[PDB]
Design a protein around this motif. Structure first.
Motif, mmCIF file in Angstrom:
data_model
loop_
_atom_site.group_PDB
_atom_site.id
_atom_site.type_symbol
_atom_site.label_atom_id
_atom_site.label_comp_id
_atom_site.label_asym_id
_atom_site.label_seq_id
_atom_site.Cartn_x
_atom_site.Cartn_y
_atom_site.Cartn_z
ATOM 1 N N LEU B 38 24.285 61.253 30.646
ATOM 2 C CA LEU B 38 25.288 60.209 30.802
ATOM 3 C C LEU B 38 26.380 60.303 29.739
ATOM 4 O O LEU B 38 27.548 60.029 30.020
ATOM 5 N N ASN B 39 26.015 60.686 28.520
ATOM 6 C CA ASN B 39 27.016 60.805 27.466
ATOM 7 C C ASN B 39 27.935 61.998 27.701
ATOM 8 O O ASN B 39 29.124 61.942 27.406
ATOM 9 N N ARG B 40 27.386 63.081 28.228
ATOM 10 C CA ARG B 40 28.212 64.238 28.513
ATOM 11 C C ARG B 40 29.150 63.861 29.656
ATOM 12 O O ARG B 40 30.318 64.237 29.653
ATOM 13 N N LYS B 44 33.498 63.786 29.906
ATOM 14 C CA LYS B 44 34.378 64.322 30.938
ATOM 15 C C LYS B 44 35.284 63.254 31.553
ATOM 16 O O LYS B 44 36.467 63.507 31.788
ATOM 17 N N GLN B 45 34.744 62.063 31.803
ATOM 18 C CA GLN B 45 35.543 60.984 32.380
ATOM 19 C C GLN B 45 36.648 60.589 31.410
ATOM 20 O O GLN B 45 37.770 60.278 31.812
ATOM 21 N N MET B 46 36.312 60.604 30.125
ATOM 22 C CA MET B 46 37.242 60.229 29.070
ATOM 23 C C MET B 46 38.510 61.076 29.042
ATOM 24 O O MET B 46 39.590 60.581 28.713
ATOM 25 N N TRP B 85 33.060 49.991 40.188
ATOM 26 C CA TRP B 85 33.932 50.253 41.322
ATOM 27 C C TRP B 85 33.302 51.325 42.221
ATOM 28 O O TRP B 85 33.188 51.144 43.437
ATOM 29 N N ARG B 86 32.885 52.434 41.621
ATOM 30 C CA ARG B 86 32.258 53.503 42.389
ATOM 31 C C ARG B 86 30.998 53.021 43.095
ATOM 32 O O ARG B 86 30.743 53.394 44.244
ATOM 33 N N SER B 87 30.210 52.195 42.409
ATOM 34 C CA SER B 87 28.971 51.672 42.975
ATOM 35 C C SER B 87 29.290 50.814 44.191
ATOM 36 O O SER B 87 28.568 50.824 45.189
ATOM 37 N N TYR B 213 23.753 52.179 18.312
ATOM 38 C CA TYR B 213 22.387 52.406 17.874
ATOM 39 C C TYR B 213 21.967 53.846 18.168
ATOM 40 O O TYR B 213 21.493 54.556 17.280
ATOM 41 N N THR B 214 22.147 54.280 19.411
ATOM 42 C CA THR B 214 21.756 55.636 19.775
ATOM 43 C C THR B 214 22.608 56.681 19.067
ATOM 44 O O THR B 214 22.154 57.798 18.847
ATOM 45 N N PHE B 215 23.837 56.318 18.717
ATOM 46 C CA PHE B 215 24.731 57.229 18.019
ATOM 47 C C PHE B 215 24.176 57.439 16.609
ATOM 48 O O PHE B 215 24.064 58.569 16.131
HETATM 49 C C1 C0R Z 1 26.908 54.980 26.088
HETATM 50 C C2 C0R Z 1 25.849 54.874 27.294
HETATM 51 C C3 C0R Z 1 25.784 56.281 28.069
HETATM 52 C C4 C0R Z 1 27.101 56.600 28.828
HETATM 53 O O1 C0R Z 1 28.091 56.931 27.872
HETATM 54 C C5 C0R Z 1 27.536 55.423 29.805
HETATM 55 C C6 C0R Z 1 27.544 54.009 29.089
HETATM 56 C C7 C0R Z 1 27.892 52.895 30.126
HETATM 57 C C8 C0R Z 1 29.219 53.089 30.892
HETATM 58 C C9 C0R Z 1 29.284 54.525 31.452
HETATM 59 C C10 C0R Z 1 29.652 54.661 32.740
HETATM 60 C C11 C0R Z 1 29.747 56.058 33.371
HETATM 61 O O2 C0R Z 1 30.089 56.192 34.540
HETATM 62 C C12 C0R Z 1 29.404 57.291 32.522
HETATM 63 C C13 C0R Z 1 29.029 57.093 31.221
HETATM 64 C C14 C0R Z 1 28.930 55.717 30.515
HETATM 65 C C15 C0R Z 1 30.191 55.766 29.563
HETATM 66 C C16 C0R Z 1 26.183 53.756 28.367
HETATM 67 C C17 C0R Z 1 25.952 52.420 27.575
HETATM 68 C C18 C0R Z 1 24.842 52.780 26.556
HETATM 69 C C19 C0R Z 1 24.511 54.281 26.775
HETATM 70 C C20 C0R Z 1 24.049 54.963 25.437
HETATM 71 O O3 C0R Z 1 24.258 54.410 24.335
HETATM 72 C C21 C0R Z 1 23.347 56.335 25.427
HETATM 73 O O4 C0R Z 1 23.499 57.031 24.197
#
Ligand code: C0R
Lengths: 12, 253
Positions: B38-40, B44-46, B85-87, B213-215
């Motif tokens: 999810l972070n990767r 990419k979205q960023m 939105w996508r959901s 926290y996870t960071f």
């Molecule tokens: C940042 C997290 C992972 C990831 O970054 C998520 C984010 C929530 C929003 C989001 C929507 C997306 O469509 C892709 C990534 C993302 C932007 C999440 C909230 C906590 C989670 C973490 O803290 C994992 O380390």
């Protein structure tokens, strides 16, 4: 400053 | 003459397109794997988000420093809103559509170790369905989220910022008049939408708490963050934890 992805993308 | 076109048409044009997560449903759904993935994906979205913001009417005229500040403060809000939105568009809000190859159901929500946060983001998706949100309203609201929080001591070009944000608010007022009609159901919808924008602040506050926290514990948890996020978070965290951020509300402010 030098580099910074955000800066690069905004001035690319 | 014919109509008096608004940035709305422009916004629809620069709207970024779906990005894949590169997820493989056949490998183990560990929290490490899910969050790192999810972070990767966020990384990419960023890139698309910055590219999108760069050409936004008004925003493009703000100094570089203010643009960076605004993006660093609102990236989570933008990411979460786009997720809902996508959901909404892809699953009628039955699942969390992070990407076409990564759709969260209840099971993944538990394995992500982010269950409650996923629920919060899901609740926003539910609101989209209850209101039958339109792409027009959505795009303007996205801009408003980008302009939703500033430094406690204001921006470098504060006055210009306030004028731009005011215009985008008026713009939303225009759109909320479109979709429906019946004066009544427009006064009402504008209220519901701005109330929804306000609710994003509370959600983002919880999202960021888990993110920071996870960071911080990235090494021990084995949760990877792409360079794009490392940079943003490293700057955002100190400010947010010191109370430098100032969320802007439409109601209960
Ligand atoms: C940042 C997290 C992972 C990831 O970054 C998520 C984010 C929530 C929003 C989001 C929507 C997306 O469509 C892709 C990534 C993302 C932007 C999440 C909230 C906590 C989670 C973490 O803290 C994992 O380390």
């Amino acid at each position: 400053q030098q580099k910074s992805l955000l800066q690069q993308l905004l001035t690319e | 003459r014919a109509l008096t076109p608004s940035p709305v048409m422009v916004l629809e044009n620069i709207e970024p397109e779906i990005v894949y997560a590169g997820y493989d449903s056949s490998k183990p759904d560990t929290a490490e794997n899910l969050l790192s993935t999810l972070n990767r994906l966020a990384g990419k979205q960023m890139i698309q988000v910055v590219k999108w913001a760069k050409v936004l009417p008004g925003f493009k005229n703000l100094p570089l420093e203010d643009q960076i500040t605004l993006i660093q403060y609102s990236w989570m809000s933008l990411s979460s809103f786009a997720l809902s939105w996508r959901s909404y568009k892809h699953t009628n809000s039955q699942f969390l559509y992070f990407a076409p190859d990564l759709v969260f159901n209840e099971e993944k929500m538990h394995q992500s170790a982010m269950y409650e946060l996923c629920q919060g983001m899901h609740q926003i998706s539910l609101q989209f369905v209850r209101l039958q949100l339109t792409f027009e309203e959505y795009t303007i609201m996205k801009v408003l989220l980008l302009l939703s929080t500033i430094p406690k001591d204001g921006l470098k070009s504060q006055a210009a910022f306030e004028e731009m944000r005011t215009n985008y608010i008026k713009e939303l007022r225009k759109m909320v008049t479109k979709c429906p009609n019946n004066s009544g159901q427009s006064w009402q919808r504008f209220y519901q939408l701005t109330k929804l924008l306000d609710s994003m602040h509370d959600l983002v506050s919880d999202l960021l708490e888990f993110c920071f926290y996870t960071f911080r514990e990235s090494h021990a948890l084995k949760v990877e963050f792409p360079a794009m996020l490392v940079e943003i978070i490293s700057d955002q965290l100190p400010k947010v934890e010191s109370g430098n951020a100032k969320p802007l509300y439409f109601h209960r402010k």
